[PDB]
């Protein structure tokens, strides 16, 4: 199969080259389920998805279905959505409120903590004189639990007891996240309705685009999307090129962000003038700048980001989504919209409507993004095409593109530095068996 050496060779960040096999190979995909999704922090939803005791959300870690559920002590637990008797899905709804989770096959019932608490016929069929006296103990048969940590509203989970805690894993990337998540003491909240759709491409195309690829938006991909936002009197001949900005590569972990500087037009085309004003001027913007002092946030526009492997979002448009993998050739997008909890309701309503318009299965920006990933994937079915050496050189050894205004490693807004770190980090996770070496 694949030696660590064989896997590391698929990615060359020094020479800027990627082996196309990373996006199609089935054997590599199964190793990703073990070595990447099995021990990464994965985004499941937002605390506001499960405000009250017994509230739950069913979602995924990789291809494993899990239940995320608010506990009596206000903690959140996450466990596999699988009965330990014969494997039935315990919870069949997308979310709701429970006092108990019951398996409909043989009626095994679980409390909201995931403990097994009721086995029909235990007394008659599973023991002799008292519970547990013939080797059957309900304590033994609870579904696998994940580690759970939140970061300013976002709920992340990780199966691996040996992995670093959440903040450690986030490396030097937290201020970039804060641009969206920490603008106000009030925190954020999720607009109801997670939109879910299926794209026949590899997760890494989508993870990489939000990590490192403003290039596609500053060139061809979103011309018609921008056009959709213009008044009848204007055409694409009256839209100026965007050339000034930077991108960030996290010190550890494969995270990435990019943005334009001191040009609000990228943002204006997607979110409109009302949100642009809110984002930049007045008391809410002032408070944000005090709350995220590590960054010149009022000069940053149209930011993209990925928290590796699959949590991606666009601060200021405020779409956020997880890419659930479905083999090497398919992904599900699970997206929702975040708003500052104390924003005026006209602002919340504009975030809601502009999001549906743009970054949505039906949206005028997203539809063109996915069409690209799907066509790439189709071509990689070819035998020559699947082994192509792809160019990740953009920005490589190109000097004087960093920006000392920003923490950590930076490069030009049109660059693949973030992308190179993403694939470099993937190759580490894929080739190093233990956190002994992998941890920051």
């Amino acid at each position: 199969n694949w030696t660590p050496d064989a896997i590391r060779a698929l990615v060359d960040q020094d020479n800027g080259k990627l082996d196309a096999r990373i996006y199609a190979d089935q054997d590599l995909y199964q190793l990703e389920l073990e070595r990447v999704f099995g021990r990464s922090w994965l985004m499941l939803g937002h605390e506001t998805h499960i405000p009250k005791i017994g509230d739950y959300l069913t979602t995924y870690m990789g291809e494993d279905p899990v239940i995320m559920v608010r506990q009596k002590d206000q903690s959140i637990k996450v466990f596999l959505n699988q009965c330990r008797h014969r494997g039935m899905r315990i919870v069949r709804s997308d979310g709701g409120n429970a006092k108990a989770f019951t398996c409909t096959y043989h009626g095994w019932a679980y409390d909201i903590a995931g403990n097994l608490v009721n086995v029909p016929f235990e007394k008659e069929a599973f023991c002799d004189k008292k519970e547990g006296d013939c080797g059957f103990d309900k304590a033994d048969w609870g579904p696998l639990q994940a580690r759970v940590e939140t970061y300013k509203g976002l709920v992340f989970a990780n199966w691996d007891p040996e992995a670093p805690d959440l903040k450690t894993y986030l490396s030097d990337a937290m201020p970039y996240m804060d641009v969206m998540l920490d603008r106000t003491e009030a925190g954020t909240e999720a607009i109801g309705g997670i939109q879910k759709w299926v794209i026949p491409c590899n997760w890494k195309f989508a993870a990489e685009q939000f990590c490192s690829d403003m290039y596609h938006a500053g060139t061809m991909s979103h011309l018609s999307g921008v056009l959709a936002g213009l008044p009848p009197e204007m055409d694409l001949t009256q839209i100026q090129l965007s050339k000034n900005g930077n991108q960030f590569r996290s010190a550890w972990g494969g995270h990435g962000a990019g943005w334009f500087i001191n040009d609000s037009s990228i943002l204006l085309s997607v979110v409109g003038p009302k949100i642009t004003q809110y984002w930049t001027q007045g008391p809410a913007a002032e408070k944000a700048a005090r709350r995220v002092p590590q960054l010149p946030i009022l000069d940053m526009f149209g930011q993209h980001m990925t928290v590796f492997p699959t949590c991606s979002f666009l601060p200021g448009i405020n779409t956020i989504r997880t890419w659930h993998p479905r083999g090497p050739n398919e992904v599900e997008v699970w997206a929702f919209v975040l708003v500052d909890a104390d924003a005026p309701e006209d602002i919340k309503e504009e975030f809601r409507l502009q999001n549906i318009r743009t970054f949505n299965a039906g949206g005028v920006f997203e539809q063109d993004d996915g069409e690209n990933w799907v066509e790439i994937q189709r071509v990689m079915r070819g035998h020559k095409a699947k082994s192509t050496s792809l160019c990740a050189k953009m920005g490589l050894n190109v000097p004087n593109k960093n920006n000392p205004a920003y923490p950590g490693k930076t490069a030009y807004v049109y660059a693949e530095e973030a992308a190179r770190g993403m694939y470099h980090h993937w190759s580490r996770m894929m080739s190093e068996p233990s956190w002994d070496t992998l941890k920051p």
């Binding site: 979310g95 309705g193 794209i199 929702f336 299965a361 690209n372």
Partner: protein
């Protein structure tokens, strides 16, 4: 009834409308589908009233006691939630020759049936439910099938089709969207 829950059947009138009205409404829908299926997007958009609200809510999966949570409500996230202005922008995108998800264009068929008409309390205004099957195929082998229900408010209109669409709500019979996008109109 315009605010009947989407989970509930259409509130048809005690007796069906006249044959003549049924025929005019059906014939309107068949012409609308011709425009869409032949990518006549400007001509189709002319059918949308200036006060159009075009919406397609998200549908979720729920067990018996939380069935009233099936539909994500108005005022929350949705698949479409559009006005005459936003629909105009969508149409600009569709006719630009830069819409990569539609370049090359999809092959669609909108089959229209099960048309039930209700006359509203304003003369010239109708509430209409219908079933659809939207077949979409594109490029070499891609096929997406969508089925569902449309509930419209139609207004009689002086255009060559004789109506405009004042409201359109689309029930899609999916929870997870199984297509890679919703790059076609319903």
């Amino acid at each position: 009834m315009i605010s009947t829950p989407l989970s509930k059947e259409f509130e048809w009138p005690a007796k069906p409308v006249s044959l003549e009205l049924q025929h005019q409404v059906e014939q309107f829908y068949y012409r609308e589908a011709q425009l869409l299926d032949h990518h006549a997007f400007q001509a189709w958009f002319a059918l949308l009233a200036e006060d159009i609200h075009y919406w397609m809510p998200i549908r979720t999966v729920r067990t018996a006691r939380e069935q009233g949570l099936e539909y994500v409500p108005a005022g929350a996230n949705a698949h479409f939630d559009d006005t005459h202005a936003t629909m105009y922008g969508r149409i600009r995108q569709k006719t630009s020759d830069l819409n990569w998800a539609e370049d090359p264009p999809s092959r669609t068929r909108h089959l229209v049936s099960n048309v039930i008409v209700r006359e509203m309390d304003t003369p010239g205004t109708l509430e209409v439910a219908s079933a659809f099957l939207l077949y979409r195929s594109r490029l070499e082998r891609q096929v997406d099938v969508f089925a569902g229900e449309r509930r419209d408010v139609l207004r009689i209109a002086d255009n060559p089709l004789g109506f405009q669409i004042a409201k359109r709500t689309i029930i899609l019979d999916q929870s997870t969207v199984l297509a890679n996008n919703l790059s076609v109109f319903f």
